[PDB]
């Protein structure tokens, strides 16, 4: 009895919430009421199994149990489409089919959040329906959100309404918290999206390597085997969540969390506070734990990896273990290196051994291996310090502007709305990582960019418009950053015409926040680049400054829609002389 085993383990509430999330992730189009029914029906059946694991139908796989429930209301293509195809299949075909039909960007209108009064009123009405509403919406919009974690954001989302609706300044208490939960949410969904992509597109070997690096950095004092034991467990966990097995993913996570807390003195000394918290807070806390203090006098690596007499004998015997040790030792010693950079150094070490080991004089051939690392560690450091400077001088706004052009000229074929989004998000890598010193920078920046870039890829996958994007996206997962920054001006691309209505601003612009107004401009800028790429340098910076001043004036011209109307369908060629 599996459904029963997971129900007794996780507890009713978490079980209910997880199944609802599994349902909102498969059918992101079905209404909240529909899913609620199905989830409450699965929870019944789950109880009948807890009271009789031998009861008819209680020993069949979760895929069967859950897949059956989904096919009770999936033969309605007039609202779904090809999900009926999945039902005419037997497990695990039916399961893999569903997963494959997870829409990264559903045709779902972002949900503008009501006022504090409205929300708090709705919350106090039916506290359960309110929260389930939350889970439903999040999951269906982010089909690859880390399930267990989502439950954690729901526990804090509730608590935020729990403490703020009983407050003096309800909006002052609730909004900064709802904004933060929103930021940490996207973040959690994106950062997980990348993990699922790693496992699904590059295999388990890949993710395990990533984990080994990230975990060796976080628990530098832990022994290799304790790290290895953790990487295996963590991988099994993410493999389930990414494969839609949420109930077993949360179960195994919790078990892994238990292990970690029971073995602190062998993993990290930063975990003591984490291992106080309730299970949901504990888990989130552990994944957010700060790197431990690196053990003091660490030894040279060249000893066991370069001068040793067994290097090649060891690299041949167990390559995954020898290299794992190399990554573990190099990672733990460099919490200042991005995970990707660490993986590159590992790949370098590997290749030079693959070459040298079978040579006449191996020991002399790879004798300078470590020297190859230098230009690999510096390239990113330099590009950072430089970009960070540029960022300090341009401000986030003018920095996104610079990146808007750089990336619009790189892949013109990409949607303008999509260019503005990705560019703006990438420009946020300046504000979010330049604040840290050159010690915490690379891992901050480069790993964040990995996420934004992965998001780009998975978004481009749907409707591909550039083979260059698809290249970088499908090639090495580790080098996606370098590959993207690599790209140069696309001289091929042909001008997007010139719709004189695309360069005509209206009154409605004057009542938007400065952020919106910036988006409006950045959008027009992308278009300007599309209509005149190749030949255009900081002469765009001249038109960009002319739009800001031109809008600033019109929004204060005692205007009657005029300043913008006339100086719009006719002022275009004024500035369009260049």
């Amino acid at each position: 009895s599996e459904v029963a085993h997971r129900f007794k383990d996780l507890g009713e509430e978490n079980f209910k919430a997880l199944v609802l999330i599994a349902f909102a992730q498969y059918l992101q189009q079905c209404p909240f009421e529909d899913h609620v029914k199905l989830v409450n029906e699965v929870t019944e059946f789950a109880k009948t199994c807890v009271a009789d694991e031998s009861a008819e139908n209680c020993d069949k796989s979760l895929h069967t149990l859950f897949g059956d429930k989904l096919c009770t209301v999936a033969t309605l293509r007039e609202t779904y489409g090809e999900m009926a195809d999945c039902c005419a299949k037997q497990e695990p075909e039916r399961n893999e089919c569903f997963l494959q039909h997870k829409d990264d960007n559903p045709n779902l209108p972002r949900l503008v959040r009501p006022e504090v009064d409205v929300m708090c009123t709705a919350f106090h009405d039916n506290e359960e329906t309110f929260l389930k509403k939350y889970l439903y919406e999040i999951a269906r919009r982010h089909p690859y959100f880390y399930a267990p974690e989502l439950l954690f954001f729901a526990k804090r989302y509730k608590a935020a309404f729990t403490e703020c609706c009983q407050a003096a300044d309800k909006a002052a208490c609730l909004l900064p918290k709802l904004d933060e939960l929103r930021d940490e949410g996207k973040a959690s969904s994106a950062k997980q999206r990348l993990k699922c992509a790693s496992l699904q597109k590059f295999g388990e070997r890949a993710f395990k390597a990533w984990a080994v690096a990230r975990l060796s950095q976080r628990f530098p004092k832990a022994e290799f085997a304790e790290v290895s034991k953790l990487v295996t467990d963590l991988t099994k966990v993410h493999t389930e969540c990414c494969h839609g097995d949420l109930l077993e993913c949360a179960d195994d996570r919790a078990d892994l969390a238990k292990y970690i807390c029971e073995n602190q003195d062998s993993i990290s000394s930063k975990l003591k506070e984490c291992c106080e918290k309730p299970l949901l807070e504990k888990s989130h806390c552990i994944a957010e734990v700060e790197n431990d203090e690196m053990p003091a006098d660490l030894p040279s690596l060249a000893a066991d990896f370069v001068e040793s007499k067994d290097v090649c004998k060891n690299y041949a015997e167990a390559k995954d273990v020898f290299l794992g040790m190399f990554l573990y030792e190099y990672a733990r010693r460099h919490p200042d290196y991005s995970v990707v950079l660490l993986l590159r150094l590992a790949k370098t070490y590997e290749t030079t051994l693959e070459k040298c080991c079978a040579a006449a004089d191996p020991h002399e051939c790879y004798a300078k291996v470590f020297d190859e690392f230098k230009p690999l560690v510096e390239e990113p450091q330099n590009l950072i310090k430089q970009n960070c400077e540029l960022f300090e001088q341009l401000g986030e706004y003018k920095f996104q502007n610079a990146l808007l052009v750089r990336y619009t000229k790189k892949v013109p074929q990409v949607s303008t709305p999509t260019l503005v989004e990705v560019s703006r998000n990438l420009g946020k890598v300046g504000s979010k990582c330049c604040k840290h010193p050159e010690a915490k920078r690379m891992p901050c920046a480069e790993d964040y960019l990995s996420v934004v870039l992965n998001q780009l890829c998975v978004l481009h996958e749907k409707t591909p418009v550039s083979d260059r994007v698809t290249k970088c996206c499908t090639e090495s997962l580790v080098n996606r950053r370098p590959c993207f920054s690599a790209l140069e001006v696309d001289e091929t691309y042909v001008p997007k015409e010139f719709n004189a209505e695309t360069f005509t601003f209206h009154a409605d612009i004057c009542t938007l926040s400065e952020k919106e107004r910036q988006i409006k401009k950045q959008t027009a800028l992308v278009e300007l680049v599309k209509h005149k790429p190749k030949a255009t340098k900081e002469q765009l910076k001249a038109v960009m400054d002319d739009f800001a001043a031109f809008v600033e004036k019109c929004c204060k011209a005692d205007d009657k829609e005029t300043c913008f109307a006339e100086e719009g369908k006719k002022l275009v060629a004024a500035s369009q002389a260049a």
């Binding site: 230009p375 510096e378 390239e379 990113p380 330099n382 370098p482 920054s485 690599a486 140069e488």
Partner: protein, 216 residues
């Protein structure tokens, strides 16, 4: 398995004399007829002469008199004697075998590396290598003033290969050859990553390794 190795080609002074040899490794060759085909830079193929298993040798009309094929079967090597060489003799000379089974047919299966013979009176001058420093932009090297051809350029002793474009040598109005071997690299790699072009011109036993690094 079976491949023809030629050699003996290089810079020759007009009216000079040269002997290209062809040695095969992997087969007998004593039972086969070997041909000689040349090809001037940019032009097509031009059959010269042939030597059968026996000693009998036939020559193209134009060649008979200046070129002379011969075979040293005690050493598994067929030579091609070039006398009274003219500037129009400059061409990549190939050593090809007539596919076993034919004799007069124009069928040649096994060829040779093909040695280049530059028949010119000019003396042999090594190349000078100049850095074509960067403006993700590219850099490269400029191998100027060398003769005769050929010259080989490598990047970071072989390490860097993709992105590299070694241009075809051209003769300068000064009679000497010139070329540029560039490579496209990620801009942010400049300064951080060392870029060296290795130029080698064996005709003059010239070797250089020029480091290409942005200027300012």
């Amino acid at each position: 398995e079976v491949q023809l190795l030629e050699s003996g080609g290089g810079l020759v002074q007009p009216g000079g004399s040269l002997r290209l040899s062809c040695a095969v490794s992997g087969i007998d060759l004593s039972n086969y007829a070997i041909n000689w085909v040349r090809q001037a830079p940019g032009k097509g193929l031009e059959w010269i002469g042939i030597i059968w298993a026996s000693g009998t040798t036939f020559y193209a009309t134009w060649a008979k008199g200046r070129f002379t094929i011969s075979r040293d079967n005690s050493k598994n090597t067929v030579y091609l004697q070039m006398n009274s060489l003219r500037a129009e003799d400059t061409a990549v000379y190939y050593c090809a075998r007539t596919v076993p089974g034919y004799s007069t047919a124009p069928y040649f299966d096994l060829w040779g590396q093909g040695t280049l013979v530059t028949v010119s009176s000019a003396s042999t001058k090594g190349p000078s290598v100049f850095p074509l420093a960067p403006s993700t932009a590219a850099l490269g090297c400029l191998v100027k003033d060398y003769f005769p051809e050929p010259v080989t350029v490598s990047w970071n002793s072989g390490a860097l290969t993709s992105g590299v474009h070694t241009f075809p040598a051209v003769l300068q109005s000064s009679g000497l050859y010139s070329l540029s071997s560039v490579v496209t690299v990620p801009s942010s790699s400049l300064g951080t990553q060392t870029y060296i072009c290795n130029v080698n011109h064996k005709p003059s036993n010239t070797k250089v390794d020029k480091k290409v690094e942005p200027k300012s």
